[PDB]
Design a protein around this ligand. Structure first.
Ligand SMILES: Nc1nc(Nc2ccc(S(N)(=O)=O)cc2)sc1C(=O)c1cccc([N+](=O)[O-])c1
Length: 294
């Protein structure tokens, strides 16, 4: 970029590439997302405007939006590490529970905020959760599928992670609800706790069946309407629900209770971000600072 000096490539998003860059003029360091194409939508460029006026301490700030040369650049505030790297770095010892709780609490605040402003993330995963030396964690790279929908992959032949995708999406639901983000966050919560992905599916069906084998194949009793969903098949195997205590050991009962509500099959029974913030699990929440190696 003529105005920006690419320090280095820091990620391959589901829409474009992300670079750490410095503003040649101001000298500020930012994250620059490059988007692919011969026109550019409108319902999207305006869905983006909404995201710019979306300011909250737990949401990565979208500084600028620049459309030029059949390219779409998104300028974001820069953070030094994502949760995927931090979990890997903490794989031997595990992230301490108070930090896990603080991170979950903050992300729920972020979600409560975007959801009350009718904004959905749609693609929450460790790679889209950024942390700093101050103990904060922020939601990054919002989906924006309401317009730009969901591309076959990311942008250039790349395996899109399905591990955090809600069951209703896998079953062909056309309209997503804020509940999809709660499910993804629940999956991440479990992963921080156990240090292993909850549902590591390698295909859409494998993803779906991994969920079924653990939470039990859903039926009309626990999920009214499930059998009438677009991709539901009566031929789905019928797995029994596994004891929840085997799921995220050795998480305490307050933690397991909160997770079970974040993982309810029925989107309408799934706990909201606002209600989750009030769960007894957060009675003793604090804000520890992580040990970050940058
Ligand atoms: N602002 C920002 N800072 C970042 N800093 C960063 C610093 C360190 C690491 S890492 N992996 O070395 O810990 C990763 C990101 S990433 C980032 C993003 O807004 C972003 C995140 C995921 C996907 C996309 N996207 O456009 O597709 C963009």
């Amino acid at each position: 970029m003529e105005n920006f000096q690419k320090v280095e490539k820091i990620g391959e998003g589901t829409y474009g590439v992300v670079y750490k860059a410095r503003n040649k003029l101001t000298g500020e360091v930012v994250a620059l997302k490059k988007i692919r194409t011969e026109g550019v939508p409108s319902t999207a460029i305006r869905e983006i405007s909404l995201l710019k006026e979306l300011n909250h301490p737990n949401i990565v700030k979208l500084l600028d939006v620049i459309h030029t040369e059949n390219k779409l650049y998104l300028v974001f505030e820069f953070l030094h590490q994502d949760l995927k790297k931090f979990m890997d770095a903490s794989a031997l010892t595990g992230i301490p529970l108070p930090l896990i709780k603080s991170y979950l609490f903050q992300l729920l605040q972020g979600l409560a905020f975007c959801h009350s402003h009718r904004v959905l993330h749609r693609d929450l995963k460790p790679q889209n959760l950024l942390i700093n030396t101050e103990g904060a964690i922020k939601l990054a790279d919002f989906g924006l599928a309401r317009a730009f929908g969901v591309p076959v992959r990311t942008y250039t032949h790349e395996v899109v992670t399905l591990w955090y995708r809600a069951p209703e999406i896998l079953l062909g639901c056309k309209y997503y609800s804020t509940a999809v983000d709660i499910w993804s966050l629940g999956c991440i919560f479990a992963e921080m706790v156990t240090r292993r992905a909850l549902f590591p599916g390698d295909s859409e069906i494998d993803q779906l069946f991994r969920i079924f084998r653990t939470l039990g194949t859903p039926d009309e009793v626990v999920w009214p309407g499930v059998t009438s969903m677009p991709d539901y098949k009566p031929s789905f195997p019928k797995w029994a629900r596994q004891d929840f205590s085997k799921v995220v050991p050795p998480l305490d009962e307050d933690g397991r209770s909160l997770l079970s509500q974040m993982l309810h099959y029925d989107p309408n029974k799934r706990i909201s971000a606002k209600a989750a913030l009030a769960h007894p699990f957060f009675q003793d929440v604090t804000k520890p600072v992580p040990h970050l190696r940058l």
